[PDB]
Ligand SMILES: *CC(=O)N(c1ccc(C(C)(C)C)cc1)[C@@H](C(=O)NC1CCCCC1)c1cccnc1
């Protein structure tokens with residue numbers, strides 16, 4: 001019983017975190033096999049942060065210019081290449097603690113565990129979602145960049161996020177581990193505004209199904225609705241459209257609880273049109289949209 | 305910028321988690337040096353769960369009766385002793401991944417990271433507080449017992465909690481790692497009711513100071529108050545008394561933000577007497593009391 005915002009165990013990732021220093025600027029790096037991955041803005045100086053020419057900064061740069069440390073252990077650099085907004089550093093030693101690993105590009109609404117690091121040293125973990133506007137609401141101070149987001153499948157670590165920068169909003173933008181930014185952002189000090197953020201509808205429904213399982217079911221109404229009728233009320237409240245793929249994914253939660261997806265859709269419409277009246281669902285006075293159907297199943301099943 | 309519920313890295317603890325089987329019943333164990341710690345209700349059967357005689361169950365029990373596994377590796381049992389509500393099992397091998405470790409008994413309101421485990425295999429981490437009634441609002445399924453709560457000081461792991469049982473409420477009770485239960489609970493199936501839970505006042509103030517730092521300061525009023533005057537309104541709203549030790553602990557947050565503790569006390573009184581009017585503080589429509597002053601400093605400082 002009970003329902004908490006839950007991260008994966010960070011042990012597998014803790015042993016991949018190194019420090020990458022280049023001139024004055026230091027930040028976090030990921031060490032998998034004989035390669036060290038980090039943000040490409042480690043070749044920036046306080047002058048070039050406005051609009052840096054990264055191709056002309058990497059050309060005037062050699063193997064020995066990059067300083068990489070794993071604790072009090074120094075790695076030699078044998079090669080360097082730039083891929084999009086990521087630096088890749090070939091190194092003489094292969095990481096002896098490399099896990100089974102994949103690189104995947106997650107979709108909006110998909111969640112992951114973040115390990116926040118400063119000087120290649122972990123300081124904590126939290127769970128969060130890739131927002132529809134392609135930002136994340138995270139907790140990152142100066143020197144947090146290079147920190148990674150990941151999910152665990154048995155003993156295989158799927159890396160989806162590397163952290164880069166903060167927007168004037170106080171929210172966070174970053175890349176996959178091929179160096180492609182999530183959303184339309186670039187790595188420089190400029191006027192980058194995230195779009196109006198919507199609510200991850202499929203995630204709020206999944207959260208409501210968790211509440212029913214854990215004994216909180218005061219919000220369960222006596223109506224039903226249609227996809228089209230619900231999707232009309234969704235757009236009104238800045239809720240992402242519900243798809244035939246979203247209803248299919250909820251089928252498992254639908255089956256277990258004995259509540260048809262469109263009945264839960266109808267219940268949600270009532271919560272949106274009437275509010276909560278200062279009541280709590282799983283100890284929250286808000287609608288929580290940072291839990292996936294797979295998150296709810298995992299936590300209400302007990303998948304190790 | 306940003307503020308999240310944040311756990312410590314679980315890597316150090318992941319390598320201390322073993323399985324303890326005894327007859328039919330299996331649960332989670334902690335392996336530090338040449339000793340394995342687990343709940344004493346592993347010597348219970350489905351008959352004796354009502355009111356077990358643990359002294360008369362351990363007497364009719366030998367070293368070989370206990371099965372301990374670390375992955376696909378079996379440990380030999382050389383000794384066994386019962387300490388309060390905890391089993392201690394001496395074993396031929398010493399854990400090669402034992403960290404620097406202490407056993408401490410945390411106070412009500414003090415927070416820690418929980419690593420949830422099933423069959424000696426971790427499944428995730430979350431942060432939570434020891435409630436004033438001496439329960440915790442956690443996420444635990446069947447076989448979660450033996451899972452531990454901890455804090456990290458540099459590279460030293462302070463173990464404060466071992467999980468045991470769930471109350472009809474759907475909330476959780478457990479022990480320190482000398483086997484003494486937090487609160488007045490016993491390890492059997494009986495009528496155990498937790499008291500009326502109060503709010504951790506010192507933690508809500510600390511949370512409000514984090515909000516000011518992260519740019520959310522709409523709730524900052526133009527009044528001040530006294531300890532006695534505030535403590536009167538606290539008891540009214542089931543808020544734990546504020547002490548001269550609580551105001552001292554907030555002094556660092558007071559200094560940095562330029563807001564005197566009693567001014568923040570006055571602002572809190574207004575939030576309690578008027579509500580939030582459907583507004584959000586650090587993305588929460590509730591007052592969050594599961595962040596300590598040290599948690600807020602750590603997360604707003606960047607302590608690894
Ligand atoms: C890497 C890092 O921690 N930060 C950072 C991010 C981006 C850059 C440039 C791409 C070179 C502009 C440099 C340094 C810092 C940080 O100072 N971010 C600012 C970047 C400019 C706009 C305002 C934020 C940082 C701090 C907190 C969270 N993430 C990154």
Ligand SMILES: *CC(=O)N(c1ccc(C(C)(C)C)cc1)[C@@H](C(=O)NC1CCCCC1)c1cccnc1
Pocket residue numbers: 001331345348353444445446447448449468469470471472491492493
């Ligand atoms: C150890 C375990 O997972 N659970 C458990 C807890 C306590 C006992 C006895 C002390 C022998 C009664 C046995 C097993 C289970 C569980 O079934 N708890 C129930 C204990 C009796 C009252 C109702 C709960 C468990 C499940 C979920 C979370 N924690 C513990």
